[PDB]
Amino acid sequence: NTYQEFTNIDQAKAWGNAQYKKYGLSKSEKEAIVSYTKSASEINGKLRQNKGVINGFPSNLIKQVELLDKSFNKMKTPENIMLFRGDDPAYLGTEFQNTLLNSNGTINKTAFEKAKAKFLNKDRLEYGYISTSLMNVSAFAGRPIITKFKVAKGSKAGYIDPISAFAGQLEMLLPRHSTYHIDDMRLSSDGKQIIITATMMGTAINP
C-alpha cells in the first residue's frame, strides 16, 4: 500500500547503514560490488547489448556477474520503499537523444507526448542492474528524467553505499533482468524534467 520515502539524508544514511551491517556479504561479493561501482556503464552496456546472455563474456566478468546475482540472496529490503534514479534522454530510445530537450532546457512537449505514448501504462525489462538512490540527490539535478520506483517489502535490493568507490549517492542497487511497470509520467513544476513513477516487479535471475 504505502512506500517509505526518505526526506532527510542522515535518516536515510542511518537506515541504509543498518541494512548493510546485516547482509553478511562474502569477501568475493564485496569485491564484485566495489568493481561494479567503478565500471557500471560497461557491465550494464554489455548486458543490454547481449540481452542478458553472459556466455561470450570474458571469464572474470562472468564471475563478477554471478557474484553480483548471488549477493541479492542476502540483500532484501525489509519494507515497502521508494527509490530514485536520474536519466539522460537516450533512456527513452535513440529517437529522443536529440529531440527531448528544447534549446532553452525545457522538455519539448511533443517529445513528451511521444514518450508517454511509448511507455505509459506499459512494462519495461532492464537487462542491466539498476543503480538507484534513497533520495532525489543533487547528482541528478541536471538530469531531464527522474524515475521513482516503488519497491515492495521482501524484494531484492541492497544498500551498497558503504563499499561504493564514490561518495554521497545513498546508493541502493537492484538486480539485473528486472521488470517494472510505468504507472505515471508527468512534467515537473518548472517543466525541466519528466517525473516517472514505476512499480518494480521481479527479476528472472535467481541463483
Side-chain angles (χ1 to χ4, degrees), residues 2-207:
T2 190
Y3 295 79
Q4 164 83 212
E5 184 179 337
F6 284 103
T7 46
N8 182 282
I9 287 168
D10 298 323
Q11 279 209 315
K13 238 173 168 167
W15 177 93
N17 277 162
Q19 302 313 301
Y20 179 77
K21 278 187 176 161
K22 282 195 283 194
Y23 295 151
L25 300 175
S26 82
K27 172 196 77 185
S28 290
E29 283 167 347
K30 291 168 173 179
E31 290 175 355
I33 286 173
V34 172
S35 172
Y36 173 85
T37 61
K38 304 178 192 179
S39 70
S41 58
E42 169 64 2
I43 291 162
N44 290 336
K46 286 195 93 153
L47 285 168
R48 288 190 205 97
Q49 176 177 46
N50 293 280
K51 315 213 290 227
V53 182
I54 65 170
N55 291 36
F57 292 1
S59 145
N60 68 314
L61 185 55
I62 297 179
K63 178 165 182 37
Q64 179 178 15
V65 167
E66 290 183 348
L67 286 167
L68 289 179
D69 293 351
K70 201 194 300 187
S71 307
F72 286 102
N73 291 334
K74 313 187 177 163
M75 300 196 305
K76 326 271 200 180
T77 177
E79 59 177 346
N80 288 348
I81 192 152
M82 224 83 133
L83 303 181
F84 290 89
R85 212 204 132 65
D87 282 287
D88 294 317
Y91 168 74
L92 301 170
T94 50
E95 68 265 36
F96 294 92
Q97 168 97 223
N98 300 306
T99 61
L100 185 69
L101 290 161
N102 291 323
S103 302
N104 66 72
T106 47
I107 306 304
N108 186 291
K109 188 253 174 61
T110 290
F112 176 55
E113 289 301 318
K114 180 77 84 157
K116 294 168 75 171
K118 184 173 178 174
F119 293 116
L120 184 65
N121 209 11
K122 294 201 195 160
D123 273 3
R124 178 152 178 188
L125 173 69
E126 176 54 47
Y127 289 112
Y129 301 90
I130 310 167
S131 305
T132 63
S133 300
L134 289 179
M135 289 178 78
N136 194 357
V137 296
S138 61
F140 15 94
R143 298 246 201 170
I145 300 149
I146 303 302
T147 304
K148 305 193 274 156
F149 293 109
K150 293 173 162 189
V151 182
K153 171 187 177 173
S155 293
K156 286 171 175 194
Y159 194 71
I160 63 159
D161 210 82
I163 55 175
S164 179
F166 297 95
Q169 311 318 308
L170 298 171
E171 186 162 9
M172 287 280 281
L173 190 70
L174 299 169
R176 72 173 173 116
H177 216 95
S178 296
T179 297
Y180 52 95
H181 187 73
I182 290 159
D183 308 321
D184 193 53
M185 301 177 59
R186 62 209 171 310
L187 287 164
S188 59
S189 276
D190 69 356
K192 292 195 174 169
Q193 297 177 311
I194 297 174
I195 310 311
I196 299 182
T197 306
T199 298
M200 190 62 51
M201 308 183 143
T203 164
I205 290 161
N206 305 276

